[PDB]
């Protein structure tokens, strides 16, 4: 129940404002900046502000804060969803999200803001559907918005019917300083770029554990996805009935399903780091990386970030494989490895100086995060079984998909 959706800037200036109900005065935006400054300076800053009887709930963008003022007991989740949809629409329409496009795309920005939400209730949020009625370079609105299928425009025709899938894995490990992993969860991400002719009804089928148990084949390798979040095109009723994933893919790249299940296996990359930091004399970084993944998979672009001292200077790196560079901007040692074959072991011996004068305040111990990305390796073991592409006209589709294994929240707690 937002009252006025406005876009701020880094200096407190409102780049663009669009009131939807008019119950909140436009002058309340000026007090948002002082309120945010006071909250940040006292540790009480939150995404949802409160200027008397008006609440300023907004998120932080790349360069401006999309604060949406409200007065009644409006749904905070609804406001956040509307802000996320607006950000996604802006990203789809404008390649950059900064002040350079706010002051240059006002003619289309105002129209998009007016069409997106009326009276504080959003009605259209699909960038592909919205691009057929609001352009910066007007016909009647498309029937897709009025029709039930609001995520697949009818009449799309292509020379070929090729759909590219992307089974991107997210290996997140929360390893404590004692050496044990506390939060070790892998979140799947099935992103597909559907490019076909017409409005095909995709019938996604994988080796799900529940599906295998229902069919009676609960004995082979099945992915045990604890949480499965289907897209808007995916029919919730069909999935709830008999695990049938039937939905119409959209035109372009979109996220169909987002699996999320816990992982009880050993980490793909094991980092054994030591800190022989002398008392204002020197420091030693005996960091050893052990690859627990399969030898057939190579972790391309392996970047194990080792947090070095903030005031360290004149550092020396004695490693074995991969270039080690210290970035003063980040205040950490970037153990960058181009190719990391499975089962490899890289040993590094850091050595940096330290000023004689002790620091005035503590700096903390940021966790060590690895950036391993091993392609063609599915940690969860989930493999796509079938993709039922059915069209009324009748055509031979050529579906494709690739499995990518990367590191998500794979941080290692320091000592």
């Amino acid at each position: 129940s937002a009252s006025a959706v406005y876009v701020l800037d880094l200096k407190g200036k409102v780049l663009i404002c669009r009131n939807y109900r008019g119950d909140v005065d436009m002058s309340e935006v000026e007090h948002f900046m002082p309120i945010l400054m006071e909250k940040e300076e006292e540790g009480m800053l939150s995404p949802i502000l409160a200027h008397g009887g008006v609440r300023f709930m907004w998120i932080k963008h790349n360069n401006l804060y999309l604060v949406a003022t409200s007065k009644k007991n409006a749904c905070v989740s609804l406001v956040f969803s509307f802000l996320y949809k607006v950000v996604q629409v802006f990203s789809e329409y404008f390649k950059e999200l900064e002040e350079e496009s706010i002051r240059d795309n006002f003619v289309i920005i105002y129209e998009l803001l007016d069409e997106l939400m009326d009276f504080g209730y959003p009605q259209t949020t699909d960038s592909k559907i919205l691009q057929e009625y609001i352009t910066q370079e007007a016909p009647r609105p498309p029937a897709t918005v009025t029709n039930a299928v609001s995520w697949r425009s009818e009449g799309i025709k292509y020379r070929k019917n090729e759909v590219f899938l992307d089974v991107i894995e997210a290996v997140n490990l929360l390893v404590s300083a004692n050496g044990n992993v506390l939060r070790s969860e892998i979140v799947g991400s099935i992103k597909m770029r559907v490019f076909l002719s017409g409005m095909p009804e995709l019938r996604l089928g994988l080796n799900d554990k529940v599906l295998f148990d229902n069919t009676g084949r609960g004995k082979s390798k099945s992915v045990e996805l604890e949480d499965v979040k289907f897209h808007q095109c995916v029919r919730l009723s069909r999935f709830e009935n008999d695990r049938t994933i039937s939905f119409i893919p959209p035109d372009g790249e979109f996220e169909l399903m987002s699996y999320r299940l816990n992982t009880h296996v050993k980490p793909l990359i094991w980092i054994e780091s030591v800190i022989e930091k002398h008392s204002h004399s020197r420091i030693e970084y005996m960091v050893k990386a052990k690859s627990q993944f399969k030898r057939r998979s190579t972790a391309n672009n392996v970047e194990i970030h080792i947090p070095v001292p903030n005031d360290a200077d004149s550092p020396k790196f004695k490693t074995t494989v991969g270039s080690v560079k210290w970035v003063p901007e980040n205040s950490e040692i970037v153990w960058s490895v181009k190719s990391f074959p499975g089962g490899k072991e890289y040993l590094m011996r850091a050595h940096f100086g330290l000023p004689s004068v002790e620091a005035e305040d503590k700096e903390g111990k940021p966790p060590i995060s690895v950036k391993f990305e091993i392609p063609y390796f599915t940690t969860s073991g989930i493999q796509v079984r079938y993709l039922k592409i059915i069209e009324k006209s009748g055509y031979q589709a050529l579906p494709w998909v690739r499995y990518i294994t990367q590191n998500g929240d794979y941080q290692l707690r320091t000592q």
Binding site: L165, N300, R385, Y386, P399, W400, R402, Q406
Partner: peptide, 18 residues
């Protein structure tokens, strides 16, 4: 070629489940 694993063709349905 493509970084992150080469794209592989997918099936149409579970042919072994009828």
């Amino acid at each position: 070629d493509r970084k992150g694993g080469s794209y592989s063709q997918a099936a149409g349905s579970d042919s072994a489940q009828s």
